């Protein structure tokens, strides 16, 4: 049943058990995201959707916090701005300087949300340098450059839930995590290209384009 | 120089007192000519007065002849196209007072067929600017000797 | 570079973001000005407490009272102190950065006395 709440002072109504981000969308408040797509399951790995809720001490994940009656939510106060800048610092630590050769340039969420919710300049100058990773060969239709992955797990969720191609998975652990088929395989599904529209970064790109 | 020191500052904190003054002045003008002034805006040491095409000559007479507002110089005339509006055009007069060292604006509205009164009766320099606005946007400035 | 902007530690951008702190374009129609007249302002309130004063604002948000009506219903302390000055004189076109002129004559001047041009500081 529809409840009611407060968001940056505006009041909105949506059904129970809903995600806060859907409420914010209803109220027009623009909130960032990488891991959240409407047609896919939820996860909370990107940590960019953080907002302040008076009930809880830390900022919480709009993508996953259930909506409750009478809860008040700010998305403008300094804590949120700092937390977003910090997350984007972290996201762009180990991201290669490939924007000119990335086919997503001009249509990448990482650019836009770093320009809008992020720092003018980075403090990562380390001499040991950025992480690297190898490119996978998952077939003609999808080109890979997996130094650009942010590990959003949109690809996995799509493949295993909407398509039925469970060959795509999350190998490894930690910073050496690697989305891929653990051995050389091909992404056998007739829905394979929708993955390209799902990845925010150009780690999976159309090949004949 | 070892370290350069440039303090961080907003450029708009410089304007707050002038802005309060402009608000008071606009309030005086709205109280003084309630028949004409629909509204007024303020933004960073710039004032704007919103009026209707009938109110152009009267308000200009007030702004040219009144003592506190000797806006004698005509800086510019400009039209702007907002097709989303019923009255798509929005004619804009800018004014200046060398006496008090101040500028002020004055906005009206028009259409492709609804004309605007010409202030060549007062400011002769408006002749060419109104000919421009006609040629550029199509606005018709009634009373103009040679448009 | 300059120091507080090249500082690597306590230099958040959201404090030196002067673009998203831009000052709003205020708009005041006759409705919003008569409320400031019949009522007052946050600095000089003249408003009733509670939902009574709320609907008092609401009466003006709509065409309930007019600008000339509340111009005639305004006591001397209202006008002479919120429309005009306390002295009763109207305000003048404000200057942001005033300039008091001064004349230089004789030897400092760019041209001598005979010429029809002068020199202002």
């Amino acid at each position: 049943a529809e409840i009611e709440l407060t968001i940056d002072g505006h009041k909105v109504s949506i059904e129970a058990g809903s995600a806060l981000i859907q409420a914010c969308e209803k109220a027009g408040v623009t909130v960032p995201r990488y891991c959240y797509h409407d047609k896919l399951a939820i996860a909370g790995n990107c940590r960019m959707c953080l907002v302040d809720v008076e009930r809880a001490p830390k900022p919480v994940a709009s993508c996953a916090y259930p909506v409750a009656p009478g809860m008040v939510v700010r998305t403008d106060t300094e804590r949120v701005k700092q937390a977003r800048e910090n997350v984007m610092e972290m996201m762009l630590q180990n991201h290669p300087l490939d924007c000119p050769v990335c086919d997503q340039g001009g249509e990448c969420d990482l650019q836009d949300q770093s320009m809008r919710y992020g720092r003018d300049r980075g403090r990562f100058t380390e001499i040991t340098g950025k992480r690297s990773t190898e490119d996978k060969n998952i077939g003609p239709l999808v080109k890979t450059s997996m130094n650009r992955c942010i590990h959003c797990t949109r690809c996995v969720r799509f493949a295993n839930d909407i398509a039925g191609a469970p060959e795509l998975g999350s190998s490894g652990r930690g910073n050496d995590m690697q989305i891929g088929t653990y051995l050389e395989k091909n992404l056998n599904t007739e829905l394979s290209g929708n993955v390209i529209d799902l990845c925010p970064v150009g780690a999976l790109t159309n090949k004949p384009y | 120089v070892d370290e350069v020191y440039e303090p961080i500052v907003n450029p708009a904190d410089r304007y707050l007192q002038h802005v309060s003054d402009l608000h008071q002045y606009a309030k005086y003008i709205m109280a003084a000519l309630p028949k004409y002034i629909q509204g007024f805006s303020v933004w960073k040491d710039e004032l704007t007065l919103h009026v209707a095409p009938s109110a152009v000559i009267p308000v200009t007479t007030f702004l040219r002849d009144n003592t506190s507002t000797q806006y004698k110089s005509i800086i510019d005339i400009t039209a702007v196209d907002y097709p989303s509006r019923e009255n798509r055009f929005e004619v804009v007069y800018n004014f200046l007072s060398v006496r008090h060292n101040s500028r002020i604006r004055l906005k009206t509205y028009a259409t492709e067929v609804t004309p605007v009164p010409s202030i060549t009766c007062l400011y002769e320099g408006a002749n060419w600017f109104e000919r421009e606005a006609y040629d550029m946007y199509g606005v018709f400035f009634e009373g103009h000797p040679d448009l | 570079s300059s120091y507080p902007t090249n500082d690597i530690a306590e230099n958040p951008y959201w404090k030196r973001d002067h673009r998203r702190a831009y000052p709003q374009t205020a708009f005041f129609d006759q409705k919003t000005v008569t409320g400031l007249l019949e009522l007052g302002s946050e600095a000089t309130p003249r408003i009733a407490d509670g939902e009574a004063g709320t609907k008092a604002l609401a009466n003006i948000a709509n065409g309930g009272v007019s600008f000339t009506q509340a111009l005639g219903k305004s006591s001397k302390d209202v006008i002479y102190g919120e429309v005009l000055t306390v002295n009763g004189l109207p305000p003048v076109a404000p200057t942001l950065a005033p300039k008091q002129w001064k004349i230089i004559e004789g030897e400092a001047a760019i041209y001598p006395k005979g010429y029809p041009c002068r020199t202002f500081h």
């Binding site: 623009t30 403008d76 001009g106 249509e107 969420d109 836009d112 949300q113 320009m115 809008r116 | 708009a12 304007y15 707050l16 802005v19 309060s20 608000h23 309030k27 | 673009r19 998203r20 702190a21 831009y22 000052p23 709003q24 205020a26 005041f28 919003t32 409320g35 400031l36 009522l39 007052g40 302002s41 946050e42 600095a43 000089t44 309130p45 003249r46 408003i47 009733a48 407490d49 509670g50 009574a52 004063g53 709320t54 008092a56 604002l57 919120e82």
Partner: peptide, 29 residues
């Protein structure tokens, strides 16, 4: 102009109205 940004670039500004021109808030009670 088709490369125009899909994200809102500059959020709402900051009020600089003087308090003498702000519509009064009635006291809560």
């Amino acid at each position: 102009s088709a490369g125009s940004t899909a994200w809102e670039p500059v959020g709402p500004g900051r009020d600089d109205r003087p308090d003498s021109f702000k519509l009064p808030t009635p006291k809560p009670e």
